[PDB]
Amino acid sequence: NHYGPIPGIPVGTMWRFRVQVSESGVHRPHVAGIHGRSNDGAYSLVLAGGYEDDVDHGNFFTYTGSGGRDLSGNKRTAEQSCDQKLTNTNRALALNCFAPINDQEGAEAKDWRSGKPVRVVRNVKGGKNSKYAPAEGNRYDGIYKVVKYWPEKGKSGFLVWRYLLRRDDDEPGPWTKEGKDRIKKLGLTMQYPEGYLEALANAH
DNA sequence: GGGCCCGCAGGG
DNA sequence: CCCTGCGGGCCC
């Protein structure tokens, strides 16, 4: 539903599980990387190193579309086994870009800052191929905007949709000096589900 | 009512 | 250690 930050949830907020990010409003889907409607646009997305074509550079990153995958056998993830399409959440994210939607060669917003805002969450699994992933769980990293998107062959050899997102947010990134100071001042700390830690105090 | 899914953990 | 496939929410 909502575009932009969630009122009163500062950049640097951390949650241990995806479900907690969801109940916060920050990223509603419990599994999916993109939260979006195909005739409106995308509200939030997660970098979790789930797609090999994701490259994260912090203040900007190239995100991969979802799909191009065989999820037979009641799967949630798989390797690329066919071309992605500009449909569903992929189409949603493309609409955020401040340029006419083109599903053949993609598009670029000259005035990208005028595009729709995307809430961006970074998850620890993104750490294999990124300097910007938190050490644990999920972290709210602020607002980014889609500069451009285009199709190309991924590492797998199949077509993927690729999106350049660039940061556009007055709250500083949590990996920066000021981001770290703010987090410290606010006392931001990993949020666990209720009862979770107690259940872990059950090592015997 | 069916599709989708950047998680997660039980059980091998 | 590695593997399998479940709920449930949200979309359409």
Cα separation, A190 vs A181, in Å, equals 16
Residue A7 lies in a domain: no
Residue A122 lies in a domain: yes
Resolution limit in angstroms?
2.2
Q: How far is the CA of A182 from the C1' of B11 (A)?
A: 43
Q: Which residues of A are annotated as a binding site for DNA?
A: 48-49, 54
Put residue A61 in one of left, alpha, beta given phi > 0 → left and psi -120 to 50 → alpha: beta
Q: Check if the beta carbon of residue A36 is closer than 8 Å to that of residue A92.
A: yes
Q: Check if the beta carbon of residue A125 is closer than 8 Å to that of residue A17.
A: no
Q: How far is the CA of A121 from the C1' of C11 (A)?
A: 21
Pick the closest to residue A26 from A193, A138, A125, A183 (CA basis): A138
- Give me the domain span that covers residue A90: 14-204
Residue A26 lies in a domain: yes
Cβ neighbours for A130, distance < 8 A, ≥ 6 positions apart: A47, A49, A56, A122
Task: Provide the b/e sequence for A171-200 (b: ≥16 CB within 10 Å).
Answer: bbbbbeeebeebbeeeebeebbeeeeeeee
Q: How far is the CA of A192 from the C1' of B6 (A)?
A: 20
Residue A144 lies in a domain: yes
Residues in reach of strand C, judged by a CB distance below 7 angstroms, are A 1, 19, 22, 28-32, 35-40, 73-76, 88, 92
Q: Check if the beta carbon of residue A11 is closer than 8 Å to that of residue A171.
A: yes
Q: Is the CB of A19 under 7 A from strand B?
A: yes
Residue with CA nearest C6 C1'? A74
Q: How far is the CA of A200 from the C1' of C1 (A)?
A: 22
Domain of A135, CATH number, reads 2.30.280.10
Q: Is the CB of A88 under 7 A from strand B?
A: yes
Number of domain units in chain A: 1
Residue A3 lies in a domain: no
Pick the closest to residue A8 from A132, A162, A153, A186 (CA basis): A186
Cα separation, A96 vs A109, in Å, equals 10
Residue A4 lies in a domain: no
**Would you give the distance in Å from CA A119 to the centre of its chain?**
7
Residue A111 lies in a domain: yes
Beta bridge partners of A37: A41
**Would you give the distance in Å from CA A141 to the centre of its chain?**
9
Residue A149 lies in a domain: yes
Q: Is the CB of A77 under 7 A from strand B?
A: yes
Cα separation, A151 vs A157, in Å, equals 12
Pick the closest to residue A176 from A26, A12, A6 (CA basis): A12
* Residue A82 in tokens: 């066919």
